[PDB]
Structure formats: C-alpha cells, structure tokens
Design a binder for this molecule. Structure first.
Ligand SMILES: CCCCCCCCCCCCCCCCCC(=O)OC[C@H](COP(=O)([O-])OCC(O)COP(=O)([O-])OC[C@@H](COC(=O)CCCCCCCCCCCCCCCCC)OC(=O)CCCCCCCCCCCCCCCCC)OC(=O)CCCCCCCCCCCCCCCCC
Ligand SMILES: CCCCCCCCCCCCCCCC(=O)OC[C@H](COP(=O)(O)O)OC(=O)CCCCCCCCCCCCCCC
Ligand SMILES: CCCCCCCCCCCCO[C@@H]1O[C@H](CO)[C@@H](O[C@H]2O[C@H](CO)[C@@H](O)[C@H](O)[C@H]2O)[C@H](O)[C@H]1O
Ligand SMILES: COCCOCCOCCOc1ccc(C(C)(C)CC(C)(C)C)cc1
Ligand SMILES: COCCOCCOCCOc1ccc(C(C)(C)CC(C)(C)C)cc1
Lengths: 54, 68
C-alpha cells in the first residue's frame, strides 16, 4: 500500500493500459509500411536526379 | 414451571456418575489445559520487529518499481 501510493490497488494496470502495446505494434507496422514507400519514392527521385545530371 | 424431576435430573433415583480420571504423575490434558504447553510467543519478538521492518521495506520497494 505504501509503495503503490494507492490504498485500493495498483494504477496503470488493466486492459485499457495493456492494449497500448498492441496499438504500438500496429502503429509501428503502419509507420514502417509508409516509411518504406516514402523511402523508395525518395530513392527513385534521387537516382533520377543523379543519373540525369551526374 | 418445570417439575422437580426435571430440575434434579432424575425421576425416581439419582444415578451415580463415574468421576473424571486424573492420570497421576502428569498434567491434565484438556481443551483448557493447553497454556502449559503453548504460552504466548516470547522467543522471537525482536526478530518479529526486524522482519516486519524488512518486509514492509522490500514490499514497498518492489511495489514502487512495479508501479513506475
Ligand atoms: C498502535 C496500535 C495499537 C497500540 C496499542 C495496542 C498494542 O500495541 O498492542 C500490542 C499488539 C500485540 O502485541 P505484540 O505481540 O507486540 O505484536 C507484535 C507487534 O505488532 C510487532 O511489531 P512491533 O510493535 O514490535 O514493532 C514493529 C515496528 C515496525 O517498524 C516498521 O518498519 C513500520 C514503519 C512505519 C512507518 O513498528 C513500530 O515499532 C513503530 C512504528 C509504528 C507501528 O501489537 C500491536 O498491535 C502494535 C503493532 C501493530 C501495528 C499495525 C497496527 C495496524
Ligand atoms: C489458532 C490457535 C489458538 C492459539 C491459542 C494458544 C493456546 O494455547 O491457548 C491459550 C489461550 C489463553 O492462554 P492463557 O492460559 O494464558 O489465558 O487460549 C485458551 O486458553 C484456549 C484456546 C482454545 C483454542 C485452541 C485452538
Ligand atoms: C421461564 C418461563 C417458562 C419457560 C420454562 C421452560 C424453559 C426451558 C428452557 C430452559 C431449559 C434448560 O434446560 C436444562 O437443560 C439441562 C442440560 O444442561 C438439564 O440438566 C439436567 O441434566 C444434566 C445432564 O444432562 C444433569 O447433570 C443436571 O443435573 C440436570 O439439571 C436441566 O435439567 C434443564 O433444565
Ligand atoms: C493440526 O495441528 C496439528 C497439531 O499437532 C499437535 C502436535 O502435538 C505433538 C505434541 O508433542 C509434544 C510432546 C511432548 C512435549 C513435551 C513433554 C516435551 C513438552 C513440555 C516439556 C513443555 C511439557 C511437547 C510436545
Ligand atoms: C496451541 O496449541 C495447539 C496444539 O496443542 C498441542 C498440545 O500438545 C500437548 C501434548 O500433550 C502431550 C504431552 C506429552 C506427551 C508424552 C507422550 C510426550 C508424555 C510422556 C512421555 C510422559 C508419556 C503426550 C502428549
């Protein structure tokens, strides 16, 4: 009770707080999915600019 | 209210009751004769104080770490 700081029970436990890990997994999946597309686009653009000028 | 037979415990004749056995040479063993063998705890009181302190402290440590 003294270490928790609460007299009833722990805090930041529960499915509302555990689901944030799965939300982070999905968010990172989406972020990597978009970042691969953006990086491929920018790499194509750079390879175009270089093979046109250099 | 109730008859004398019910009060005295017998209708006509008072029956003899076998007395209680004593077991000479040793203490009586009854539900009320147990403090002879089991007194209040007196041997590990200071250890009790120390262990209560350490239990509180270790529990508080791990609870705070879990919460954080
Ligand atoms: C106070 C409420 C009761 C007061 C009068 C009743 C009474 O004391 O009867 C003795 C009664 C029974 O006699 P006992 O055999 O000595 O009990 C063992 C002690 O509890 C064993 O504990 P202790 O009393 O020997 O010492 C434990 C120690 C523990 O120290 C700590 O680490 C606690 C830190 C708190 C901050 O706590 C303290 O000494 C003082 C801090 C406050 C407690 O003990 C108590 O009730 C006092 C301790 C109860 C504490 C939690 C109460 C809820
Ligand atoms: C839990 C067990 C109860 C522990 C009681 C200690 C004891 O021997 O018992 C002793 C205590 C009181 O001892 P005292 O003779 O000092 O008053 O309680 C009793 O006298 C009867 C306890 C009956 C319950 C037995 C279980
Ligand atoms: C008072 C208002 C009107 C209501 C009257 C009736 C009230 C009845 C409720 C009280 C009952 C008490 O019941 C009581 O039980 C005990 C058992 O412990 C009986 O006890 C009897 O038997 C025991 C052993 O068995 C004997 O050792 C004892 O000498 C004898 O009295 C009492 O004889 C009886 O009186
Ligand atoms: C469910 O709980 C289990 C309860 O078990 C009761 C254990 O009973 C065993 C008791 O054994 C003894 C035998 C002798 C003694 C002596 C005679 C040595 C005690 C003495 C010197 C204090 C009178 C103490 C305990
Ligand atoms: C709080 O109490 C809970 C448990 O209580 C246990 C009480 O135990 C007392 C046991 O009584 C005895 C004591 C001694 C003995 C022996 C056999 C050791 C006595 C002997 C050697 C004199 C015959 C037997 C029973």
């Amino acid at each position: 009770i003294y270490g928790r700081g609460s007299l009833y029970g722990y805090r930041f436990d529960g499915e509302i707080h555990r689901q944030e890990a799965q939300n982070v997994i999905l968010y990172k999946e989406k972020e990597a999915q978009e970042m691969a597309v953006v990086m491929e686009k920018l790499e194509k653009e750079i390879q175009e600019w270089l093979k046109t000028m250099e | 209210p109730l008859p004398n037979a019910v009060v005295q415990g017998y209708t006509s004749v008072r029956g003899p009751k076998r007395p209680l056995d004593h077991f000479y040479g040793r203490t009586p063993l009854n539900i009320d004769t147990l403090w002879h063998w089991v007194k209040f705890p007196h041997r590990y009181d200071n250890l009790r104080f120390a262990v209560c302190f350490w239990a509180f402290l270790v529990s508080a440590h791990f609870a705070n770490k879990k919460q954080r």
